[PDB]
Every structure is written in C-alpha cells, then in structure tokens.
Design goal:
The structure is a homodimer. Chain A is of the alpha/beta class. Chain A has 6 helices and 5 strands. Chain A has a 5-stranded parallel beta sheet with strand order 3-2-1-4-5. In chain A, 30% of the residues are buried. At the A-B interface, helix 1, helix 3 and helix 6 of A face helix 1, helix 3 and helix 6 of B. The structure holds phosphocholine (2 copies). The site of one phosphocholine has 6 residues of chain A, from strand 1. It is classed as transferase.
C-alpha cells in the first residue's frame, strides 16, 4: 500500500546532504509518494534568513532529483493538520518542538542531515586550500 | 527498442545546467539507458583544469539524479570505438573536432549547456549583490 511522505524545506543550493535526506524520506516505506514542499522566498527570509536561489531556481533543481515524486511550491511555512488532510499525507519527514504534535500523532519521521557537504563548504574548500 | 546513450563529463559542482543536459540525453529517444561517465581527478586536472570535488564526490551526487541510469566512474578521458563496443553504446551525447569520428558514424547527439546557472555564478550573485 502506497504511503504519502511530505518533506518540506528551503532546499537552497541543493547539495549531497539534501539529496541523502530526500532519499531517506523516499525510502521510509516500501511504496511511497514523496511530496516535497519548497518554502517561499519571503517567509524563508522572514523566519530563517537570506536565501541565495529564488523559489523558482530551488524548485527547478528538485525536479531533477530521483527521489522526488511531487512538489508543492511554494509550500506553507508551518504544517497544519488541515494540510495533512488536504494532500492526504501520512507522514512528515524532517530533520529533528514544533513537530511534537506530529510525533504525538505517529506521523513524524526523522531524517538526518549530512555535515560538511554543503556548497558553502566547497567554496571554503578551494579557499584556505588555495589562493592561500 | 532500448537505446544506450553515453554522456561523459567532469560533473564538478553539479548544477541545473548539468541536470538539463542529462535530461536532454536521457530523452533523446523514447526508451533509453543513460550511462554517465565521470572523468578522473588526475586527467581532468591534466587536460582541463583544477576540479573542486573529488571523483567520489562528483560520482555520489550523480547517483541522485533522476535521468542517470548507470555510471562509469572513472571513465576514460577519450572515447574510443572499442569503448562503444565494450559498453554497447549507441550514441555519445555531449556539448558540441574530437567528435567528428562519432558524427561521421551517426553516433553523436549534441546536447546544450545552460549559461549563468553555475555554482560559481551563485557565489558571484551573493557577491556584488551583497556584502557590496
Ligand atoms: C520551513 N519549514 C518551517 C516548513 C521547515 C524548515 O525547513 P529546513 O530548515 O529543513 O530548510
Ligand atoms: C573529459 N571528456 C574529454 C571525456 C569530455 C569533457 O567533459 P565536459 O568538458 O563536458 O565536463
């Protein structure tokens, strides 16, 4: 039976860390639909910080990712129970409390980040490790 | 009938431009297997220039790309006719002469780059457009 997974995020400058997280969410059960929510520029800036890529750029890259079945772009900043019913979502997948209500309901699936793999760190790599 | 497509490249700091190129190669015919060749650190440096990501890092990202069916990593720097027979490749897909022999044989499929979308340009974006 197919299980609908929802993974929201900014997905700015998508890197191997994001990709492994999406893979993990896609693979939480044998048969899934992975829906990915991409947060708006305005709300990301307002609640998180400056985004490098636009909503359109962040959404267009996700389309090329193997694990992504459906995209909600933009997505709401805060998951609600109405949202879960509206899109028939069985589990919310996110790094790990604003998610307590999901955990209480049995609908939270923790996914893990990967340190050091970010695009930021790859410029930091060529810096210090060259041009001195 | 399934058509085997071979697309080689450095695939350093994979960006939307690479992804659209891979999509294009994957979609050259109705049914394909897209094999992607990832060039070695040594030969890339020797023939092209410094690479940011290692062979392993460049190969691991490609695994997450929807369009990629198989990966040869590392791949030879120069395609040969023996290589085509060894992997049963029907067409080489590459941006557009070292490919004249492929074109002469009917086995070359040009794919297009996309300007401005590169990770280099996205740091250039936040620079000049901020921290002044
Ligand atoms: C924006 N949000 C509150 C829905 C989730 C935060 O997303 P990220 O912090 O995993 O990018
Ligand atoms: C390395 N090569 C000669 C096989 C193809 C060059 O690859 P790219 O220049 O498309 O990255």
């Amino acid at each position: 039976k197919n299980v609908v997974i929802y993974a929201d995020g900014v997905y700015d400058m998508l890197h191997l860390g994001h990709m492994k997280q999406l893979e993990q969410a896609k693979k939480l059960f044998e048969n899934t639909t992975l829906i990915v929510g991409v947060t708006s520029d305005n709300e990301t800036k307002l609640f998180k910080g400056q985004v490098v890529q636009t909503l359109e750029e962040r959404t267009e890259t996700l389309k090329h990712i193997r694990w992504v079945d459906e995209i909600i772009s933009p997505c709401p900043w805060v998951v609600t129970p109405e949202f879960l019913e509206k899109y028939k979502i069985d589990y919310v997948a996110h790094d790990d409390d604003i998610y307590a209500w999901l955990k209480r309901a049995g609908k939270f699936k923790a996914t893990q980040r990967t340190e050091g793999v970010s695009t930021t760190d790859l410029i930091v790599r060529i810096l210090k490790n060259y041009e001195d």
